[PDB]
Design a protein around this ligand. Structure first.
Ligand SMILES: [Mg+2]
Ligand SMILES: [Mg+2]
Ligand SMILES: [Mg+2]
Ligand SMILES: [Mg+2]
Ligand SMILES: [Mg+2]
Ligand SMILES: [Mg+2]
Ligand SMILES: [Mg+2]
Ligand SMILES: [Mg+2]
Ligand SMILES: [Mg+2]
Ligand SMILES: [Mg+2]
Ligand SMILES: [Mg+2]
Ligand SMILES: [Mg+2]
Ligand SMILES: [Mg+2]
Ligand SMILES: [Mg+2]
Ligand SMILES: [Mg+2]
Ligand SMILES: [Mg+2]
Ligand SMILES: [Mg+2]
Ligand SMILES: [Mg+2]
Ligand SMILES: [Mg+2]
Ligand SMILES: [Mg+2]
Ligand SMILES: [Mg+2]
Ligand SMILES: [Mg+2]
Ligand SMILES: [Mg+2]
Ligand SMILES: [Mg+2]
Ligand SMILES: [Mg+2]
Ligand SMILES: [Mg+2]
Ligand SMILES: [Mg+2]
Ligand SMILES: [Mg+2]
Ligand SMILES: [Mg+2]
Ligand SMILES: [Mg+2]
Ligand SMILES: [Mg+2]
Ligand SMILES: [Mg+2]
Ligand SMILES: [Mg+2]
Ligand SMILES: [Mg+2]
Ligand SMILES: [Mg+2]
Ligand SMILES: [Mg+2]
Ligand SMILES: [Mg+2]
Ligand SMILES: [Mg+2]
Lengths: 157, 197, 127, 106
RNA sequence: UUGGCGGAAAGGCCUUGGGUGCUUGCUGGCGAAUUGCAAUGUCAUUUUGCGUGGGGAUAAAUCAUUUGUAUACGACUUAGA
RNA sequence: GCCCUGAAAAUGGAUGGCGCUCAAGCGUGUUACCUAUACUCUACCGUCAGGGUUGAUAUGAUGCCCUGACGAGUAGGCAGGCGUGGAGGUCAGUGACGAAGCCUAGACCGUAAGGUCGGGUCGAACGGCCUCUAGUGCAGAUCUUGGUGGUAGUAGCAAAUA
RNA sequence: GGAAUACUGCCAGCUGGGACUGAGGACUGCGACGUAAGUCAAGGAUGCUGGCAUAAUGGUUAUAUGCCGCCCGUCUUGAAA
RNA sequence: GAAAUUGUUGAAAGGGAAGGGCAUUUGAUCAGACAUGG
């Protein structure tokens, strides 16, 4: 032959995995993520956009709204770890929000009419609350950018 | 933090200033040094005149041409102290040194641009009072430099110009104050005040 | 088409080229350990060629594995090939260089049939 | 919005090194605005980018990025250490670099 | 566009007159999504070749030959419509 | 105590260099920071040691499996292996539909000696495995024979009248 | 006279940020919390989401960049000599 | 029909040798993957 055949050959039986022990416990957010808190997004498509926190969801994310009619950002998912939690807050008492969950955003282009109509519903309430305080509406439309002489490790936000 | 930093090297101590500049380059900050002839050196004039003469007496015996090169101008004296603190024989070295310009007097592009000082190299700050020291431009004509009077002449001329520039500017900021006043005490004023502004 | 096997680590991938094989043509690249009394290599001064020692010995569990997943087995004909039937997630075939163009169509065939992998198809391959 | 920047400006100073041996695997970054280690703690873990130009287009782009994060403080004056996925080119000592505000705990 | 000033490397600076876009000084009407939870994003300026439409300008150096204020050879210095 | 004198040698030079004067000097003290092949934890290789285990039960019992510790090296000792000519045996082994040989910043395997493969070139023979055997591995020996460079288009080709 | 505080030490006191690792591969062990059924951070990582197609990534190679590297062989206490 | 050595073509680098080590940029090159309803 071209080579003396092996004397062994291992077992082609792919074995099972050991009973792993990693429960999946809930994620407690940091004490600065109160729903209705204005958030600075730091990455992705709407980086720099100032934005209002709506709801923790089960894939650890945050429900964001913009609101759309203020700065163009939709009801959206966002990861806590790419967000500066500012120290301004809007009341979120008038806002439904309980219909929104993971499966809402589920990958099942065009835009559903539901998304569009839900937007207006949630938005108009937030916009209603935003207007009770001056220059908050503008502040939301302006983008955040660090300036010459800003040192993040000092700034309050 | 700035693209270029221009240093009025007046009243500074040669090697300390040299030192900060050599680091500033190696980290990629473009630097121009100006008024290199009003650079200071600790110790009385004679000592440094003597020290320089040592430097002079060093030359390749078989061909003084390839010998250590004794540059006599203040800029060039100062550039020596700097090169000594950079690894100039490597590309990184050369690159750093290409971010540096040194001038005697302050020539035209810079003459109308802000210069800074380097407090940790300021003679007046560092040197103990009473302690004697040396002026570079005076050290230089001492050991051969040819342009001490030509620079002083162009400097006095720049100084006239720069001060009428300043007289006019100071007269303008007066105006904006006496423009301001009206709104210095306005309602918006008070609101800004509430914020540190 | 192959087993588990952990992430194949290689530890030291460059060749080990005999000292001064880059100096003189007469000195082959094939490794040879420096013996001479002063030699900087044998004495291991900083900044020289590293020498082979058992520390580079590869993981017992991913050793001999080609990137695919299988130890390669030299195969010179059909019967040679057919040793590998049961052990198809473990080995692949390399058709010995000296196998005629016409015979390699056969072994490629039977392999196909048997689900056996071939490391070097495209043999003396037309087109 | 003349300003669009969501990062702090950095310079690439050195590899980690002794007097005569360098470790390419770690880079010493100098974060603008950071004087002391106490400050530089803010940025630990935060992602760095070096951004360079090329000739060959890739993702329809002639601009590229080398990514990595700030990992530990260095020395007494706010210099900080960093590892990148690959390892910065050393031609880049004294080049600009970018330190982002994420991962955030603000 | 009206005046000026700048020669240290000035190649830049102030000033006069309108024209034009923007104006977040203020008050409204719209837009943004789906780039899907970060990757991937504003394009800066060098050269260099080609393309067009306009304005423009229309030579010299070398080889060779020659001089000998020059010369080992190159080089130097002359001369030739 | 520090500083000054005492203090003179031959290329131009050395607190390592620059340069430093309430030091970047001398004495002392307080903290922080940088960094070896060392120390601590973990993966992997090997070596050594201790243990489990063919009880009827497919594929290595010089094996599989569990555990701990250790790793510098000339001269030198032993061990495990790689490569070459020829011999017994066996793959009813490869081959003119292309052996061997050669070339190849092409591929894969081995810590390594090396092995394997593609493309090219070629043209009649040649492998693997168990063993046997030695005229068995080169960088050196002012080694042997042969072949070739740099030197270099260089020294030079100027005695004897033309 | 009654306190505070510093300094030092202890806690099987509570907590934030950052880094490297994830070997093993059914079960068997020691526990923990539970009234219980059960649950667990208890003899070694899982879960969720996303990216990649003449590509993400990895190997080789050339070059550049930072640091580092004297000529081997030999006799010798000592060799780049 | 090897090597030394050489011409040509093509690629690259070169401020008083060249060559080597760790690391990465940049270029060239090369891979390992494959099977899921139409
Ligand atoms: Mg808007
Ligand atoms: Mg001084
Ligand atoms: Mg050096
Ligand atoms: Mg010795
Ligand atoms: Mg370091
Ligand atoms: Mg200039
Ligand atoms: Mg990112
Ligand atoms: Mg003459
Ligand atoms: Mg003497
Ligand atoms: Mg001397
Ligand atoms: Mg002493
Ligand atoms: Mg001291
Ligand atoms: Mg002390
Ligand atoms: Mg180690
Ligand atoms: Mg040993
Ligand atoms: Mg053998
Ligand atoms: Mg043999
Ligand atoms: Mg023989
Ligand atoms: Mg047999
Ligand atoms: Mg052949
Ligand atoms: Mg024949
Ligand atoms: Mg034998
Ligand atoms: Mg013989
Ligand atoms: Mg012999
Ligand atoms: Mg030989
Ligand atoms: Mg020899
Ligand atoms: Mg020898
Ligand atoms: Mg000839
Ligand atoms: Mg001749
Ligand atoms: Mg002769
Ligand atoms: Mg595992
Ligand atoms: Mg690929
Ligand atoms: Mg190379
Ligand atoms: Mg060196
Ligand atoms: Mg060197
Ligand atoms: Mg002797
Ligand atoms: Mg020796
Ligand atoms: Mg022939």
């Amino acid at each position: 032959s071209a080579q003396k055949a092996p004397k062994w050959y291992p077992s082609e039986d792919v074995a099972a995995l050991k009973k792993t022990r990693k429960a999946a416990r809930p994620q407690k957010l940091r004490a600065s993520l109160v729903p209705g808190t204005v958030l600075i997004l730091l990455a992705g498509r709407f980086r720099g956009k100032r934005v209002v926190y709506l709801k923790h969801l089960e894939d650890n994310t945050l429900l964001i709204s913009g609101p759309f009619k203020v700065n163009g950002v939709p009801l959206r998912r966002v990861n806590a770890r790419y967000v500066i939690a500012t120290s301004t807050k809007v009341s979120v008492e008038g806002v439904n929000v309980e219909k929104f969950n993971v499966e809402y955003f589920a990958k099942e282009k065009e835009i559903k009419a539901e998304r569009v109509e839900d937007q207006k519903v949630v938005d108009k309430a937030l916009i209603a609350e935003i207007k009770k305080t001056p220059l908050l509406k503008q502040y939301l439309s302006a983008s955040f950018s660090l300036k010459n002489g800003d040192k993040p490790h000092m700034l309050k936000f | 933090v700035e693209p270029v930093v221009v240093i009025d090297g007046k009243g500074h101590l040669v090697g300390r200033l040299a030192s900060v500049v050599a680091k500033q380059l190696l980290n990629g900050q473009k630097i121009v040094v100006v008024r290199a002839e009003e650079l200071n050196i600790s110790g009385e004039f004679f000592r440094n005149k003597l020290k320089y003469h040592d430097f002079l007496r060093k030359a390749t015996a078989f061909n003084k041409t390839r010998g250590p090169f004794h540059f006599r101008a203040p800029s060039r004296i100062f550039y020596k102290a700097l090169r000594g603190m950079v690894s100039h024989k490597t590309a990184r070295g050369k690159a750093a040194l290409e971010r540096l310009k040194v001038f005697e007097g302050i020539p035209p592009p810079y003459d109308k641009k802000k210069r800074v000082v380097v407090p940790q190299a300021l003679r007046v700050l560092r040197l103990k009072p009473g302690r004697k020291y040396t002026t570079l431009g005076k050290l230089s004509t001492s050991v051969g430099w040819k342009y001490e009077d030509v620079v002083a002449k162009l400097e006095a001329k720049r100084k006239v110009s720069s001060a009428e520039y300043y007289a006019k500017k100071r007269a303008f900021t007066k105006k904006v104050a006496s423009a301001n006043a009206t709104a210095a005490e306005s309602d918006v004023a008070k609101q800004l005040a509430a914020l540190g502004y | 088409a192959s087993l588990p096997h952990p992430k194949i680590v290689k530890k030291h991938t460059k060749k080990f080229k005999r000292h001064h094989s880059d100096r003189y043509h007469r000195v082959a690249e094939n490794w040879r350990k420096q013996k001479g009394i002063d030699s900087v290599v044998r004495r291991r001064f900083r900044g020289n060629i590293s020498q082979p020692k058992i520390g580079y010995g590869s993981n017992k569990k991913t050793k001999f594995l080609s990137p695919s997943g299988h130890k390669t087995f030299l195969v010179a004909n059909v019967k040679d090939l057919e040793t590998l039937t049961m052990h198809t997630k473990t080995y692949a075939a390399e058709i010995a260089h000296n196998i005629s163009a016409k015979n390699r169509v056969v072994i490629l065939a039977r392999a196909k049939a048997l689900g056996i992998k071939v490391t070097n198809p495209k043999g003396r391959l037309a087109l | 919005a003349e300003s669009h920047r969501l990062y702090v400006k950095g310079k690439h100073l050195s590899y980690q090194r002794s007097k005569r041996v360098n470790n390419p695997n770690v880079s010493l970054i100098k974060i603008e605005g950071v004087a002391t280690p106490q400050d530089a703690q803010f940025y630990l873990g935060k992602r760095i980018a070096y951004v360079y130009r090329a000739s060959k287009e890739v993702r329809g782009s002639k601009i590229r990025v080398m990514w990595g994060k700030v990992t530990r403080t260095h020395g007494n004056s706010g210099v900080v250490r960093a590892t990148f996925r690959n390892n910065l080119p050393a031609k880049t000592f004294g080049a600009s670099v970018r330190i982002f505000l994420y991962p955030s705990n603000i």
